[PDB]
Amino acid sequence: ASYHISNLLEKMTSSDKDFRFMATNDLMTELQKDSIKLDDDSERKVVKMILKLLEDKNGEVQNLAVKCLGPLVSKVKEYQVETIVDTLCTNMLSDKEQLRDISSIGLKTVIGELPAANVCKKITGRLTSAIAKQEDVSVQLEALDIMADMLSRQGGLLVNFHPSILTCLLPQLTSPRLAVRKRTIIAL
């Protein structure tokens, strides 16, 4: 009911780790088993709460939120999926390494969960500029890994975006780092 969701959301900010871990586990196990009559405002609060918890200072809560992100996207309106993808993409470019790793893991989990078309198009549009020859080697590595995983999972779609992917991947073959060369070879 709405009361249970409200109390879980309220207790998710109890400043105590045990309370923060139990409520998130309850939310995850409720979403995993046929969540009933979740009003749009409840989706909004749940998405915002999970995104904020992804920045928590304890590893256990962040890991549980990352795992919960998967079953969440199974039943939500497409707009929340788009804004979650956008938030993960902009957090991937953050200077903090923990945020980059968390966003990459969340995006990989989302890609693995997804069997839907516009999400992949937006992700590819972001990664095309991400992989470009810039001064951040780690960002290039993460974007290459994400695109390789996305291509391995599904390749039937993105018919019109393949030339752009090839055009961005080709200059990476002469990068001084051999790991970049191997990763772009795998992506090709």
Binding site: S15, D16, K17, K57, N58
Partner: protein, 88 residues
């Protein structure tokens, strides 16, 4: 009777706060010694687990003392921020 000379030396050292490494902040007993409540009772199964607990801020506290402190307060006593267990 021989002559030996050293060309180079490599050493590894560990750093910790000197205020609390010698003795716990909660209890003034030695860090390697048993806690205050583990000394009066010395014939129980809880006296064979009193070890050192470390955190992110490299603060060393007795496991029982920090567990009792984290029952009504959720901050590390010396740095005044959220405490997270790192090693035992």
């Amino acid at each position: 009777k021989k002559r030996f000379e050293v060309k180079k030396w490599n050493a590894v050292a560990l750093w910790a706060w000197d205020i609390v490494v010698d003795n716990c902040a909660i209890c003034r007993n030695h860090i390697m010694d048993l806690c205050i409540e583990c000394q009066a009772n010395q014939a129980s199964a809880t006296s064979e687990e009193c070890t050192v607990a470390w955190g992110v801020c490299n603060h060393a506290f007795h496991f029982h003392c920090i567990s009792r402190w984290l029952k009504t307060r959720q901050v590390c006593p010396l740095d005044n921020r959220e405490w997270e267990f790192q090693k035992y």
